[PDB]
Amino acid sequence: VDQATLDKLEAGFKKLQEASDCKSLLKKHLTKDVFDSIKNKKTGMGATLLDVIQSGVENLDSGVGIYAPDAESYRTFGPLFDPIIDDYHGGFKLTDKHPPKEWGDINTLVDLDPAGQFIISTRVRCGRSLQGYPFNPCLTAEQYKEMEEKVSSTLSSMEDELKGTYYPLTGMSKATQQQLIDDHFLFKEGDRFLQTANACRYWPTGRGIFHNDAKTFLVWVNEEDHLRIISMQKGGDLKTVYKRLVTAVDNIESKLPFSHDDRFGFLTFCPTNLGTTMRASVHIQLPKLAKDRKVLEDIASKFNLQVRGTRGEHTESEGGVYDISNKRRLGLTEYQAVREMQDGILEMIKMEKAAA
Ligand SMILES: Nc1ncnc2c1ncn2[C@@H]1O[C@H](COP(=O)(O)OP(=O)(O)O)[C@@H](O)[C@H]1O
Ligand SMILES: CN(CC(=O)O)C(N)N
Ligand SMILES: [Mg+2]
């Protein structure tokens, strides 16, 4: 690695060490030994440790703080990725491998909140990376557009409930984009964490959203991951939402080659999204338990759940509505990830009813 890069790494390391109140996984795991063992390494595409950690050095409030610029990074900088992955996913040993894909028996899911007293809406998404392309920081504008054409072409073959239309982000008026974000369908722009990871270059070229007219099946193109495949609807019918995602992912997989790793499962830009890449969530109101952000988070962590704001991560709850989802994605099956969300929510509803 060039000397300028080395100097920036040293400054980054010092900045992390000195931030006493920083709680990121990056600060916790980038010890002097780990740092010294990988700071001189570079992947075949030229990715360095600075490309990996810059977003977390610049944003000390990061929960994790690292990203993979390319697939090789996961191993080149394994001394840093491995402990962070183990910590975030609730145990992932050096000898563990992500289990084979398994959606599970959908009929076993339990009807949530039948009276409709708590759950506002349900969503399950997965992420996929196209084989043959690196992650955001290493893409050219030309690649972004080539990928956009490939994905939008494949999606034009979706049928029946999944049939839809592609909407390029350029092309959207300010009001059109705002409404789709306000309604929780479209990804927001200007995320400081992604920007500093060099993940928003050439914005909005190559970015956009595919969705069926009902907006129950959507695919984000070129935001954090190459693809985010999403199933969502109002209410609490997790079974229907999950079945639709399964159907969509099985179909798209037959049409587009995605990157998969024997140890990490499906590859993604952020290590928190490896493995199943699955985030099953509900927008839910638990007034007696959500009397405080922190108290709700501490209850949720006991069930391997994470709490986000109404407009997603790094936002606040509005009107008492929180996004609660399974935290873990690697080292457990797809069925198990959706079950951790379902089981935890079932328990949190029991706790809310008994609270007083
Ligand atoms: N259960 C849900 N119902 C409605 N919208 C949701 C739900 N879960 C997440 N969202 C929306 O998904 C969008 C992306 O939020 P984010 O936290 O970035 O999640 P992701 O993991 O999908 O990138 C935001 O508009 C957020 O409000
Ligand atoms: C903020 N995230 C969590 C993380 O970086 O681990 C995202 N984008 N996955
Ligand atoms: Mg997001």
Tab-separated table of C-alpha atoms and ligand atoms in Angstrom:
chain	number	residue	atom	x	y	z
A	1	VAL	CA	0.000	0.000	0.000
A	2	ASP	CA	1.165	3.576	-0.773
A	3	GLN	CA	2.552	5.692	2.043
A	4	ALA	CA	-0.317	8.254	1.927
A	5	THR	CA	-2.692	5.381	2.559
A	6	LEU	CA	-0.540	4.189	5.462
A	7	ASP	CA	-0.532	7.606	7.054
A	8	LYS	CA	-4.310	7.866	6.790
A	9	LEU	CA	-4.667	4.435	8.382
A	10	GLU	CA	-2.521	5.432	11.299
A	11	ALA	CA	-4.529	8.602	11.802
A	12	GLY	CA	-7.743	6.542	11.586
A	13	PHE	CA	-6.513	4.049	14.147
A	14	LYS	CA	-5.552	6.878	16.542
A	15	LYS	CA	-8.930	8.563	16.055
A	16	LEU	CA	-10.734	5.340	16.958
A	17	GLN	CA	-8.549	4.671	20.018
A	18	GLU	CA	-9.179	8.199	21.345
A	19	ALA	CA	-12.962	8.180	20.957
A	20	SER	CA	-13.807	6.940	24.453
A	21	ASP	CA	-17.550	7.045	23.807
A	22	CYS	CA	-17.487	5.264	20.431
A	23	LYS	CA	-19.143	1.802	20.554
A	24	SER	CA	-18.620	0.551	17.035
A	25	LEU	CA	-17.567	-3.015	16.257
A	26	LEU	CA	-14.727	-1.463	14.246
A	27	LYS	CA	-13.291	0.248	17.319
A	28	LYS	CA	-13.760	-2.854	19.422
A	29	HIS	CA	-12.072	-5.226	17.030
A	30	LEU	CA	-9.414	-3.232	15.218
A	31	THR	CA	-6.786	-3.790	17.871
A	32	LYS	CA	-3.127	-2.959	17.320
A	33	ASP	CA	-2.271	-6.620	16.493
A	34	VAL	CA	-5.050	-6.960	13.917
A	35	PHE	CA	-4.233	-3.535	12.436
A	36	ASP	CA	-0.546	-4.324	12.077
A	37	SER	CA	-1.276	-7.701	10.501
A	38	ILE	CA	-3.383	-6.305	7.626
A	39	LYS	CA	-2.638	-2.632	7.082
A	40	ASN	CA	-0.143	-3.397	4.283
A	41	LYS	CA	-2.463	-5.697	2.359
A	42	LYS	CA	-4.203	-4.999	-0.881
A	43	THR	CA	-6.656	-7.032	-2.887
A	44	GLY	CA	-6.308	-7.769	-6.604
A	45	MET	CA	-8.633	-4.899	-7.392
A	46	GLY	CA	-6.566	-2.494	-5.288
A	47	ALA	CA	-8.779	-2.425	-2.193
A	48	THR	CA	-6.943	-1.510	0.992
A	49	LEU	CA	-7.761	-1.469	4.702
A	50	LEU	CA	-8.632	2.205	4.324
A	51	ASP	CA	-11.355	1.321	1.811
A	52	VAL	CA	-12.721	-1.145	4.351
A	53	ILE	CA	-12.705	1.074	7.469
A	54	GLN	CA	-13.014	4.686	6.300
A	55	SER	CA	-16.759	4.894	6.788
A	56	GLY	CA	-16.418	3.848	10.471
A	57	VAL	CA	-13.445	6.132	11.085
A	58	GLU	CA	-15.412	9.124	9.691
A	59	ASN	CA	-18.672	8.128	11.347
A	60	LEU	CA	-17.857	7.215	14.949
A	61	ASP	CA	-21.548	6.642	15.667
A	62	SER	CA	-21.444	3.584	13.359
A	63	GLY	CA	-22.776	0.326	14.798
A	64	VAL	CA	-20.315	-1.783	12.757
A	65	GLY	CA	-18.255	0.557	10.588
A	66	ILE	CA	-16.711	-1.611	7.925
A	67	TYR	CA	-17.640	-2.706	4.412
A	68	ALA	CA	-16.152	-5.023	1.841
A	69	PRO	CA	-14.996	-3.181	-1.313
A	70	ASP	CA	-14.752	-6.491	-3.189
A	71	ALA	CA	-15.265	-10.161	-2.345
A	72	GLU	CA	-11.565	-10.853	-1.810
A	73	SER	CA	-11.556	-8.291	1.050
A	74	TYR	CA	-13.445	-10.689	3.271
A	75	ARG	CA	-10.379	-12.848	3.407
A	76	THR	CA	-7.557	-10.343	2.763
A	77	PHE	CA	-8.743	-8.433	5.820
A	78	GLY	CA	-10.151	-11.558	7.536
A	79	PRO	CA	-8.370	-10.746	10.817
A	80	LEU	CA	-10.725	-7.769	11.121
A	81	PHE	CA	-13.833	-9.136	9.317
A	82	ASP	CA	-13.848	-12.458	11.194
A	83	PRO	CA	-14.166	-11.106	14.759
A	84	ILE	CA	-16.707	-8.478	13.710
A	85	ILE	CA	-18.804	-11.079	11.916
A	86	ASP	CA	-18.657	-13.400	14.935
A	87	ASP	CA	-19.747	-10.643	17.280
A	88	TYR	CA	-22.570	-9.198	15.156
A	89	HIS	CA	-24.086	-12.542	14.113
A	90	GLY	CA	-24.094	-13.962	17.621
A	91	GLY	CA	-21.393	-16.541	17.119
A	92	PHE	CA	-19.599	-17.526	13.962
A	93	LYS	CA	-16.436	-19.493	14.591
A	94	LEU	CA	-13.427	-19.674	12.261
A	95	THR	CA	-14.467	-23.320	11.690
A	96	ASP	CA	-18.135	-22.496	10.994
A	97	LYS	CA	-19.690	-22.356	7.536
A	98	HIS	CA	-23.079	-20.880	6.661
A	99	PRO	CA	-25.658	-23.650	6.329
A	100	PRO	CA	-27.226	-24.669	3.001
A	101	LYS	CA	-30.135	-22.426	1.920
A	102	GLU	CA	-33.347	-23.588	3.504
A	103	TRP	CA	-36.582	-21.584	3.392
A	104	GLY	CA	-38.325	-24.057	5.660
A	105	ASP	CA	-41.927	-25.220	6.037
A	106	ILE	CA	-43.910	-22.013	5.640
A	107	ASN	CA	-47.019	-23.649	7.086
A	108	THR	CA	-45.444	-23.721	10.490
A	109	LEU	CA	-45.465	-19.928	10.879
A	110	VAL	CA	-47.824	-18.635	13.567
A	111	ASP	CA	-50.598	-16.061	13.055
A	112	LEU	CA	-49.233	-13.020	14.830
A	113	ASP	CA	-51.478	-10.263	16.330
A	114	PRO	CA	-54.953	-11.352	15.126
A	115	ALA	CA	-56.766	-8.418	16.664
A	116	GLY	CA	-54.444	-5.959	14.855
A	117	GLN	CA	-53.529	-4.117	18.059
A	118	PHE	CA	-49.794	-3.932	17.553
A	119	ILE	CA	-48.420	-4.611	14.057
A	120	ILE	CA	-48.741	-1.922	11.376
A	121	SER	CA	-46.877	-3.609	8.524
A	122	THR	CA	-44.554	-6.536	7.729
A	123	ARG	CA	-41.560	-6.788	5.459
A	124	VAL	CA	-38.905	-9.351	4.594
A	125	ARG	CA	-35.949	-8.533	2.341
A	126	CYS	CA	-32.837	-10.282	1.070
A	127	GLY	CA	-29.765	-8.948	-0.686
A	128	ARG	CA	-27.830	-10.405	-3.620
A	129	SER	CA	-24.611	-9.589	-5.430
A	130	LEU	CA	-24.122	-10.258	-9.131
A	131	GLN	CA	-21.316	-12.640	-9.929
A	132	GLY	CA	-18.665	-10.849	-11.970
A	133	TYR	CA	-18.977	-7.426	-10.363
A	134	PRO	CA	-17.351	-6.070	-7.232
A	135	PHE	CA	-19.154	-4.039	-4.611
A	136	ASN	CA	-19.948	-0.316	-4.750
A	137	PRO	CA	-16.579	1.293	-4.103
A	138	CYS	CA	-14.972	-0.576	-6.955
A	139	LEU	CA	-17.572	-0.008	-9.682
A	140	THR	CA	-17.295	2.384	-12.618
A	141	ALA	CA	-20.276	4.370	-13.906
A	142	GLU	CA	-20.264	2.038	-16.913
A	143	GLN	CA	-20.601	-1.027	-14.686
A	144	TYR	CA	-23.440	0.588	-12.698
A	145	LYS	CA	-25.369	1.076	-15.948
A	146	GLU	CA	-24.549	-2.368	-17.330
A	147	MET	CA	-25.780	-3.942	-14.066
A	148	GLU	CA	-28.922	-1.824	-14.120
A	149	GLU	CA	-29.694	-2.984	-17.654
A	150	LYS	CA	-29.058	-6.652	-16.724
A	151	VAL	CA	-31.308	-6.588	-13.642
A	152	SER	CA	-34.124	-4.526	-15.221
A	153	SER	CA	-34.029	-6.929	-18.203
A	154	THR	CA	-34.362	-9.968	-15.978
A	155	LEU	CA	-37.144	-8.379	-13.963
A	156	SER	CA	-39.118	-7.622	-17.108
A	157	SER	CA	-39.747	-11.422	-17.246
A	158	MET	CA	-41.473	-11.558	-13.851
A	159	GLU	CA	-45.042	-12.788	-14.088
A	160	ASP	CA	-48.376	-12.769	-12.341
A	161	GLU	CA	-48.199	-11.268	-8.826
A	162	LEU	CA	-44.534	-10.377	-9.391
A	163	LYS	CA	-45.019	-8.682	-12.772
A	164	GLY	CA	-43.968	-5.030	-12.533
A	165	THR	CA	-42.199	-1.978	-13.880
A	166	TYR	CA	-38.729	-0.496	-13.405
A	167	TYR	CA	-38.396	3.086	-12.284
A	168	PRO	CA	-34.875	4.636	-12.682
A	169	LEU	CA	-34.023	7.038	-9.806
A	170	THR	CA	-33.051	9.687	-12.335
A	171	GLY	CA	-36.404	10.208	-13.941
A	172	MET	CA	-38.052	10.712	-10.548
A	173	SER	CA	-39.146	14.188	-9.647
A	174	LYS	CA	-38.357	15.394	-6.188
A	175	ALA	CA	-41.975	14.766	-5.112
A	176	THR	CA	-42.161	11.310	-6.721
A	177	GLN	CA	-38.995	10.170	-4.910
A	178	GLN	CA	-40.083	11.699	-1.597
A	179	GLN	CA	-43.438	9.990	-1.667
A	180	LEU	CA	-41.928	6.557	-2.340
A	181	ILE	CA	-39.482	7.035	0.569
A	182	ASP	CA	-42.195	8.453	2.849
A	183	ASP	CA	-44.335	5.364	2.091
A	184	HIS	CA	-41.380	3.102	3.037
A	185	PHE	CA	-40.882	1.560	-0.410
A	186	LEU	CA	-37.816	3.277	-1.840
A	187	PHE	CA	-34.345	3.659	-0.346
A	188	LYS	CA	-33.384	7.155	0.827
A	189	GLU	CA	-30.531	9.181	-0.675
A	190	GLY	CA	-27.560	10.881	0.977
A	191	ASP	CA	-26.703	8.242	3.612
A	192	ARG	CA	-23.518	9.483	5.315
A	193	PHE	CA	-22.345	5.950	6.105
A	194	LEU	CA	-22.579	4.776	2.505
A	195	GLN	CA	-21.153	8.027	1.148
A	196	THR	CA	-17.971	7.769	3.179
A	197	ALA	CA	-17.617	4.121	2.123
A	198	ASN	CA	-17.463	5.480	-1.453
A	199	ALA	CA	-20.733	3.635	-2.185
A	200	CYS	CA	-22.660	6.562	-3.739
A	201	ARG	CA	-20.375	7.503	-6.586
A	202	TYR	CA	-22.082	8.738	-9.735
A	203	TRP	CA	-25.442	8.897	-7.931
A	204	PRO	CA	-28.099	8.375	-9.283
A	205	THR	CA	-26.646	6.631	-12.316
A	206	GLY	CA	-27.644	2.981	-12.376
A	207	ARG	CA	-29.916	3.225	-9.347
A	208	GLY	CA	-33.619	2.583	-9.281
A	209	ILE	CA	-36.562	0.520	-8.148
A	210	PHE	CA	-38.601	-2.255	-9.752
A	211	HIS	CA	-42.061	-2.947	-8.276
A	212	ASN	CA	-45.391	-4.556	-9.060
A	213	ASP	CA	-48.311	-2.146	-9.193
A	214	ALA	CA	-49.388	-3.061	-5.669
A	215	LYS	CA	-45.900	-2.279	-4.256
A	216	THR	CA	-45.878	-5.633	-2.414
A	217	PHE	CA	-42.867	-6.933	-4.348
A	218	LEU	CA	-39.978	-4.576	-4.975
A	219	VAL	CA	-36.344	-4.782	-6.036
A	220	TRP	CA	-33.871	-2.006	-5.278
A	221	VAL	CA	-31.112	-1.800	-7.908
A	222	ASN	CA	-27.657	-0.607	-6.934
A	223	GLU	CA	-28.203	0.987	-3.557
A	224	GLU	CA	-26.116	-0.687	-0.778
A	225	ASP	CA	-26.170	-4.084	-2.533
A	226	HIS	CA	-26.559	-4.842	-6.254
A	227	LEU	CA	-30.012	-6.058	-5.455
A	228	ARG	CA	-32.316	-5.908	-2.519
A	229	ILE	CA	-35.356	-8.169	-3.082
A	230	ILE	CA	-38.331	-7.109	-0.959
A	231	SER	CA	-41.754	-8.399	-0.044
A	232	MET	CA	-43.989	-6.218	2.183
A	233	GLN	CA	-47.582	-5.252	2.973
A	234	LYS	CA	-49.641	-3.569	5.639
A	235	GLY	CA	-50.780	-5.752	8.507
A	236	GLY	CA	-49.154	-8.761	10.103
A	237	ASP	CA	-49.339	-11.611	7.611
A	238	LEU	CA	-45.727	-12.733	7.781
A	239	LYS	CA	-46.555	-16.051	6.162
A	240	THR	CA	-47.893	-14.414	2.988
A	241	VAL	CA	-45.064	-11.892	2.919
A	242	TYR	CA	-42.391	-14.575	3.326
A	243	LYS	CA	-43.970	-16.932	0.783
A	244	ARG	CA	-43.937	-14.152	-1.815
A	245	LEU	CA	-40.251	-13.416	-1.134
A	246	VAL	CA	-39.406	-17.117	-1.485
A	247	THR	CA	-41.249	-17.319	-4.777
A	248	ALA	CA	-39.484	-14.205	-6.110
A	249	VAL	CA	-35.966	-15.191	-5.005
A	250	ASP	CA	-36.339	-18.746	-6.365
A	251	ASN	CA	-37.395	-17.308	-9.724
A	252	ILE	CA	-34.742	-14.605	-9.991
A	253	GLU	CA	-31.995	-17.022	-8.960
A	254	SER	CA	-32.692	-19.132	-12.029
A	255	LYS	CA	-32.119	-16.061	-14.228
A	256	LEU	CA	-29.230	-14.181	-12.677
A	257	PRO	CA	-25.931	-15.555	-11.290
A	258	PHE	CA	-25.319	-14.371	-7.733
A	259	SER	CA	-22.178	-14.573	-5.626
A	260	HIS	CA	-22.195	-17.300	-2.981
A	261	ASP	CA	-19.323	-18.395	-0.697
A	262	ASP	CA	-18.857	-21.751	0.991
A	263	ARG	CA	-18.210	-20.117	4.370
A	264	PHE	CA	-20.170	-16.840	4.179
A	265	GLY	CA	-23.244	-17.868	2.167
A	266	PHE	CA	-24.528	-15.130	-0.071
A	267	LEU	CA	-22.105	-12.215	-0.363
A	268	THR	CA	-23.066	-8.665	0.399
A	269	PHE	CA	-21.373	-5.288	0.777
A	270	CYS	CA	-21.808	-5.039	4.502
A	271	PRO	CA	-20.815	-8.021	6.681
A	272	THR	CA	-24.048	-7.720	8.652
A	273	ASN	CA	-25.913	-8.891	5.575
A	274	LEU	CA	-24.009	-12.083	4.785
A	275	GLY	CA	-25.388	-15.633	4.811
A	276	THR	CA	-29.112	-15.568	4.462
A	277	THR	CA	-28.914	-11.788	3.863
A	278	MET	CA	-32.398	-11.746	5.447
A	279	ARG	CA	-34.009	-8.962	7.390
A	280	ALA	CA	-37.628	-9.760	8.447
A	281	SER	CA	-39.252	-6.841	10.205
A	282	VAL	CA	-42.443	-5.419	11.546
A	283	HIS	CA	-43.455	-1.812	12.152
A	284	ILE	CA	-45.017	-2.201	15.565
A	285	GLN	CA	-46.398	-0.190	18.459
A	286	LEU	CA	-45.593	-1.407	21.986
A	287	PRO	CA	-46.448	1.619	24.104
A	288	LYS	CA	-45.978	0.234	27.539
A	289	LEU	CA	-42.547	-1.251	26.564
A	290	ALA	CA	-41.342	1.504	24.175
A	291	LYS	CA	-41.513	4.280	26.752
A	292	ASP	CA	-37.891	4.736	25.983
A	293	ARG	CA	-35.697	3.911	22.974
A	294	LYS	CA	-33.047	2.190	25.151
A	295	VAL	CA	-35.401	0.169	27.299
A	296	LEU	CA	-37.031	-1.242	24.161
A	297	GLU	CA	-33.610	-2.003	22.614
A	298	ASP	CA	-32.464	-3.843	25.692
A	299	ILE	CA	-35.583	-6.010	25.737
A	300	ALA	CA	-35.239	-6.704	22.024
A	301	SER	CA	-31.568	-7.692	22.164
A	302	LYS	CA	-32.446	-10.532	24.543
A	303	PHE	CA	-34.377	-12.127	21.664
A	304	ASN	CA	-31.721	-11.395	19.013
A	305	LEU	CA	-33.779	-8.550	17.631
A	306	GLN	CA	-32.728	-5.050	16.539
A	307	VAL	CA	-34.764	-1.830	16.804
A	308	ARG	CA	-34.691	0.859	14.075
A	309	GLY	CA	-36.697	4.062	13.585
A	310	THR	CA	-39.803	4.306	11.418
A	311	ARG	CA	-37.867	5.467	8.363
A	312	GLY	CA	-35.209	2.860	8.890
A	313	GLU	CA	-31.847	2.653	10.514
A	314	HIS	CA	-30.440	5.914	11.939
A	315	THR	CA	-33.839	7.424	12.424
A	316	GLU	CA	-36.257	7.896	15.291
A	317	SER	CA	-39.621	6.358	16.001
A	318	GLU	CA	-42.560	8.414	14.816
A	319	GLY	CA	-45.881	8.057	16.524
A	320	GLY	CA	-44.489	5.183	18.599
A	321	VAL	CA	-43.871	2.973	15.574
A	322	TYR	CA	-40.626	0.979	15.708
A	323	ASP	CA	-39.001	-1.271	13.151
A	324	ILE	CA	-38.105	-4.492	14.945
A	325	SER	CA	-36.296	-7.267	13.070
A	326	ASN	CA	-34.049	-10.228	13.395
A	327	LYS	CA	-30.471	-9.007	13.921
A	328	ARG	CA	-28.633	-12.171	12.870
A	329	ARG	CA	-28.279	-13.261	9.231
A	330	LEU	CA	-25.231	-15.556	9.045
A	331	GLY	CA	-24.814	-19.007	10.553
A	332	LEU	CA	-28.561	-19.815	10.719
A	333	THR	CA	-30.981	-20.768	7.940
A	334	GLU	CA	-33.513	-18.564	6.215
A	335	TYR	CA	-36.263	-20.376	8.106
A	336	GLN	CA	-34.435	-19.784	11.353
A	337	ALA	CA	-33.930	-16.081	10.688
A	338	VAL	CA	-37.615	-15.473	9.960
A	339	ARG	CA	-38.428	-17.596	13.054
A	340	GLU	CA	-36.160	-15.499	15.280
A	341	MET	CA	-38.154	-12.442	14.234
A	342	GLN	CA	-41.514	-14.168	14.630
A	343	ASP	CA	-40.679	-15.752	17.987
A	344	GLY	CA	-39.208	-12.579	19.383
A	345	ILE	CA	-42.156	-10.477	18.333
A	346	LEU	CA	-44.557	-13.045	19.801
A	347	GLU	CA	-42.698	-12.722	23.090
A	348	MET	CA	-42.513	-8.956	23.026
A	349	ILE	CA	-46.331	-8.841	22.502
A	350	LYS	CA	-46.734	-11.139	25.544
A	351	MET	CA	-44.526	-8.761	27.554
A	352	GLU	CA	-46.407	-5.668	26.403
A	353	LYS	CA	-49.775	-7.199	27.398
A	354	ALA	CA	-48.476	-8.051	30.915
A	355	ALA	CA	-46.736	-4.713	31.419
A	356	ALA	CA	-48.327	-2.083	33.612
B	1	LIG	N1	-41.982	-3.681	8.467
B	1	LIG	C1	-41.807	-2.625	7.694
B	1	LIG	N2	-42.883	-2.006	7.165
B	1	LIG	C2	-42.788	-0.903	6.398
B	1	LIG	N3	-41.626	-0.391	6.036
B	1	LIG	C3	-40.513	-0.951	6.504
B	1	LIG	C4	-40.568	-2.025	7.334
B	1	LIG	N4	-39.275	-2.419	7.695
B	1	LIG	C5	-38.514	-1.513	7.072
B	1	LIG	N5	-39.220	-0.605	6.323
B	1	LIG	C6	-38.690	0.474	5.487
B	1	LIG	O1	-37.580	-0.058	4.738
B	1	LIG	C7	-36.786	1.064	4.329
B	1	LIG	C8	-35.297	0.699	4.449
B	1	LIG	O2	-34.976	0.796	5.852
B	1	LIG	P1	-33.542	0.284	6.281
B	1	LIG	O3	-33.464	0.371	7.715
B	1	LIG	O4	-32.505	0.929	5.443
B	1	LIG	O5	-33.661	-1.256	5.906
B	1	LIG	P2	-32.939	-2.269	4.833
B	1	LIG	O6	-32.336	-3.267	5.697
B	1	LIG	O7	-34.044	-2.683	3.985
B	1	LIG	O8	-31.977	-1.473	3.979
B	1	LIG	C9	-37.246	2.314	5.128
B	1	LIG	O9	-38.141	3.101	4.273
B	1	LIG	C10	-38.087	1.683	6.216
B	1	LIG	O10	-39.141	2.500	6.732
B	2	LIG	C1	-25.716	0.453	8.586
B	2	LIG	N1	-25.738	-0.963	8.262
B	2	LIG	C2	-25.315	-1.888	9.309
B	2	LIG	C3	-23.829	-2.199	9.225
B	2	LIG	O1	-23.093	-1.374	8.617
B	2	LIG	O2	-23.416	-3.241	9.740
B	2	LIG	C4	-25.945	-1.428	7.049
B	2	LIG	N2	-26.106	-0.631	6.006
B	2	LIG	N3	-25.967	-2.747	6.867
B	3	MG	MG	-30.906	0.263	4.216
